[PDB]
Structure formats: structure tokens, C-alpha cells
Write an enzyme that holds these catalytic residues in place. Sequence first.
Site, PDB file in Angstrom:
ATOM      1  N   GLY A   1       0.852  -1.168   0.000  1.00  0.00           N
ATOM      2  CA  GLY A   1       0.000   0.000   0.000  1.00  0.00           C
ATOM      3  C   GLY A   1       0.884   1.212   0.000  1.00  0.00           C
ATOM      4  N   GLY A   2       0.473   2.236  -0.731  1.00  0.00           N
ATOM      5  CA  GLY A   2       1.293   3.410  -0.928  1.00  0.00           C
ATOM      6  C   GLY A   2       2.710   3.007  -1.280  1.00  0.00           C
ATOM      7  CB  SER A   3       5.905   4.498  -0.794  1.00  0.00           C
ATOM      8  OG  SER A   3       5.857   5.197   0.445  1.00  0.00           O
ATOM      9  CB  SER A   4       4.788   0.575   2.966  1.00  0.00           C
ATOM     10  OG  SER A   4       3.540   1.220   2.900  1.00  0.00           O
ATOM     11  CE  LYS A   5       5.792  -2.432  -2.754  1.00  0.00           C
ATOM     12  NZ  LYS A   5       7.116  -2.491  -3.437  1.00  0.00           N
ATOM     13  CB  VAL A   6       3.952  -6.577   4.962  1.00  0.00           C
ATOM     14  CG1 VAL A   6       4.369  -7.348   6.217  1.00  0.00           C
ATOM     15  CG2 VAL A   6       3.242  -5.272   5.336  1.00  0.00           C
TER      16      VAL A   6
ATOM     17  CE  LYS B   1       3.862  -0.320   7.276  1.00  0.00           C
ATOM     18  NZ  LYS B   1       2.672  -0.007   8.113  1.00  0.00           N
TER      19      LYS B   1
ATOM     20  CG  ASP C   1     -10.085   2.744   7.632  1.00  0.00           C
ATOM     21  OD1 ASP C   1     -11.257   2.698   7.167  1.00  0.00           O
ATOM     22  OD2 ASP C   1      -9.079   2.442   6.949  1.00  0.00           O
TER      23      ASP C   1
HETATM   24  C1  LIG Z   1      -1.884  -7.977   7.065  1.00  0.00           C
HETATM   25  C2  LIG Z   1      -0.721  -7.266   6.433  1.00  0.00           C
HETATM   26  C3  LIG Z   1      -1.117  -5.869   5.959  1.00  0.00           C
HETATM   27  C4  LIG Z   1      -0.118  -8.075   5.293  1.00  0.00           C
HETATM   28  N1  LIG Z   1       0.343  -6.928   7.366  1.00  0.00           N
HETATM   29  C5  LIG Z   1       0.883  -7.860   8.217  1.00  0.00           C
HETATM   30  N2  LIG Z   1       0.665  -9.162   8.130  1.00  0.00           N
HETATM   31  C6  LIG Z   1       1.225 -10.044   8.992  1.00  0.00           C
HETATM   32  N3  LIG Z   1       1.029 -11.420   8.938  1.00  0.00           N
HETATM   33  C7  LIG Z   1       0.400 -12.052   7.839  1.00  0.00           C
HETATM   34  C8  LIG Z   1       0.799 -13.358   7.602  1.00  0.00           C
HETATM   35  C9  LIG Z   1       0.268 -14.080   6.550  1.00  0.00           C
HETATM   36  C10 LIG Z   1      -0.689 -13.499   5.742  1.00  0.00           C
HETATM   37  C11 LIG Z   1      -1.289 -14.291   4.618  1.00  0.00           C
HETATM   38  N4  LIG Z   1      -2.558 -13.898   4.147  1.00  0.00           N
HETATM   39  O1  LIG Z   1      -0.714 -15.254   4.141  1.00  0.00           O
HETATM   40  C12 LIG Z   1      -1.113 -12.196   5.991  1.00  0.00           C
HETATM   41  C13 LIG Z   1      -0.579 -11.484   7.047  1.00  0.00           C
HETATM   42  C14 LIG Z   1       2.025  -9.646  10.040  1.00  0.00           C
HETATM   43  C15 LIG Z   1       2.313  -8.314  10.240  1.00  0.00           C
HETATM   44  N5  LIG Z   1       3.177  -7.900  11.359  1.00  0.00           N
HETATM   45  C16 LIG Z   1       1.724  -7.333   9.328  1.00  0.00           C
HETATM   46  C17 LIG Z   1       2.022  -6.108   9.446  1.00  0.00           C
HETATM   47  N6  LIG Z   1       2.369  -5.000   9.566  1.00  0.00           N
END
Ligand SMILES: CC(C)(C)Nc1nc(Nc2ccc(C(N)=O)cc2)cc(N)c1C#N
Length: 260
Positions: free
Chosen positions: A19-24, A38, A132
Amino acid sequence: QSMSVKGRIYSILKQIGSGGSSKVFQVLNEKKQIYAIKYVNLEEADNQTLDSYRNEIAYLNKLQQHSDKIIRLYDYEITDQYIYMVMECGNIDLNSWLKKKKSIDPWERKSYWKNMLEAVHTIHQHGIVHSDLKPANFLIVDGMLKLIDFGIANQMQPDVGTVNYMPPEAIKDMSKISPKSDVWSLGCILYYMTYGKTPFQQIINQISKLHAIIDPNHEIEFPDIPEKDLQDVLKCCLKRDPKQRISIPELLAHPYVQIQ
Ligand SMILES: CC(C)(C)Nc1nc(Nc2ccc(C(N)=O)cc2)cc(N)c1C#N
């Protein structure tokens, strides 16, 4: 493809949000323990945008001691070019889990609700109103929900946003946003865990969807169910008027969470 954060090295398994300029990213440390990192690219962040990230980080970092229903933040690195946040990974977000799910063991649904209440009651004690909330804001970790973010920095998608969980008073605010706004949305998340749909999910048109959310004389379907307590939590969370809407402290003493 790997990355360093405060010296420690982590290798990317894959990407799980943006989202925007970020990735997880789901990553592994040297002992092959799993984390979520993140990454925020600060290249084009305005000073307001920047300050919203700093603030979100300050509070997340702080509120970790106050509840175990809040995501773990292990470390972070912040430069003028970027941010890294090293967090707990969990199993998956709650939005994904719901869509890959027909119905929910009601004991597990009431367990999830207790956790959501606890996490948001925490951020409210510090003066934070998320405003939100969506299932995407919650993470499933060892059968517990944990709150992932505080609404302060801009929102992430796991991998168009959503308007279903949006509270009435947000739309008439067009001041005015209070803790009751979070109760509406927690209400819509529980509604959806109960009746397999969000309150206005059928009505796909968007203008009309916002219309229905504010419209006092539009009324909400509460299909009768065994759990009459659960039934009553939903009706109390979804009062279009916020002064009439139940509070989180009340919700925590409701029979739905307290009895048997
Ligand atoms: C939900 C989102 C925005 C991606 N962000 C995150 N997710 C996480 N864990 C996760 C694991 C696995 C799936 C998956 N759907 O496989 C999703 C989500 C852990 C986090 N600490 C964050 C953050 N910040």
C-alpha cells in the site's frame, strides 16, 4: 534476496502486503525463525506522512507492554530513506481467513471478539481511535486475534479498499469521531462472523451503500439465531446514533462475553 535491520540479516520468503510506498514481507532470520518485516520507502513522503509513521511507531512500540492482543514489534530501523519494522508474523490476517471459511465455530467467534475488544479498549485508553477498522487490521496468531495497526499511518492491503465497515458519523462529518466509531466497525466485523456477510454487503452499488449506512429508516437484518446474547451485541454496536451506541467498557461486561 535478503535485508539487514539493526545488523541482523533476514531473507525474504515472500510478500504479503502493500500500500502506498510500503510492503510487508514474510522473512526468516538466521535461525529460520519467521517474522514479518514492513518496509516503508520514504523517497516521496511529505512531512505529514512522515510524522504519521513516526507516531504510529511510537505508540505501537509503547503499547506492546499494555496488551498481548497487540502485534509484537521486535525492532525497527528508521533512516531518511526508509523504515523497517520487524514484527511477529502470525498465521494469517482475519480477512483472508474469513473468505476461506464457510461458517465459524461460535466458541471461536466469541473468543475472537473478546480479543478484538481487548485490543481496541487498549488503544482507546491511550487516546487512540482507529476509525478505520476492518478484518485486515487483525492478525490470527496461535488462535488469538491481535491488532496490527492503530489507524495512524496509512492503511495496508494483504496480498481497491472497502467501505462496509465505515461508521455513520464519519460520512456526516462532511470534530465528531469518537471511540464509538470503533464500536460500529467492530460491530460490522462480528455481524459478518455471525451472518456470513457484512451488513450491507449485498448492496454492491457504492453511493447507495453509503446511503443505506446513514439512513435511519433503512434497517438492518438480524436473522434470528441461537445466541440471543450475540444477537443483542450486534444490535447495540450498530446503533446509527453514537450517544446511544454501546461502549467498549459496557461491551466487555455484556453477557455475550461474560456468561458461560
Ligand atoms: C496484514 C498485512 C497488511 C499483510 N500486514 C501484516 N501481516 C502479517 N502477517 C500475515 C501473515 C500471513 C498473511 C497471509 N494472508 O498469508 C497475511 C498477514 C504480520 C504483520 N506484522 C503485518 C504487518 N504490519
